[PDB]
């Protein structure tokens with residue numbers, strides 16, 4: 716049951732302000748296709764979100 | 771072999787997933803091993819298998 | 820990283836993805852054009868074009884990409900807010916050791932008008948050296 720963790724991580728990725736819809740769909744589909752990897756995929760989304768922060 | 775070419779060789783990642791990894795590789799090249807590890811794990815999981 | 824330390828306008832695209840989208844855009848390019856990373860990553864660079872852009876020029880770029888070769892041209896581009904600028908633009912593919920195309924590099928140099936003679940020679944020298952720097956910086960990706 717990575718079920719709660721999967722939905723939790725999907726929700727967070729959805730709310731990342733610096734990602735576009737293509738990038739959000741990439742990570743959210745990744746999660747639902749490999750829930751066991753929920754944590755690692757969430758971390759990667761956050762690193763991508765920070766790299767795309769305004770300067 | 772280069773990181774991008776390796777990402778592209780993976781049959782069972784979709785276009786958006788491929789794009790996401792490649793952009794990640796370019797923004798933090800010091801994470802390339804970790805990124806390629808993950809892309810292979812997903813490709814294993816999404817196989818018709 | 821060395822790619823981030825390159826203080827020039829450039830983007831890098833991936834022709835192996837449908838419609839050849841931008842996968843990296845320099846800090847200078849984004850601020851010059853008034854776009855953000857979230858806005859233009861994943862987009863074909865043709866969004867820079869508009870009404871006063873010369874169609875035959877854009878055709879030369881199309882053809883060079885089809886043939887997988889270099890090209891250097893000048894054409895009218897627009898910022899996000901709609902301001903015009905001349906772009907001295909150079910394109911070139913990155914290839915692996917076997918010659919297969921991995922990415923395209925594009926380098927921009929802004930002007931207020933079409934340049935020729937020595938002014939153009941200098942600009943071309945600057946952008947071509949930059950492209951070689953970019954190719955060297957990204958050769959493991």
Ligand SMILES: Cc1cc2nc3c(=O)[nH]c(=O)nc-3n(C[C@H](O)[C@H](O)[C@H](O)COP(=O)(O)O)c2cc1C
Nearest residue numbers: 830832863864865867868877880881923924925927
């Ligand atoms: C690496 C790269 C950088 C690009 N940079 C620009 C640019 O700065 N200005 C521009 O007008 N087009 C640029 N383009 C060209 C367009 O993306 C596109 O290839 C051109 O319009 C092709 O013609 P088409 O619109 O008929 O397909 C770039 C293309 C590549 C591959």
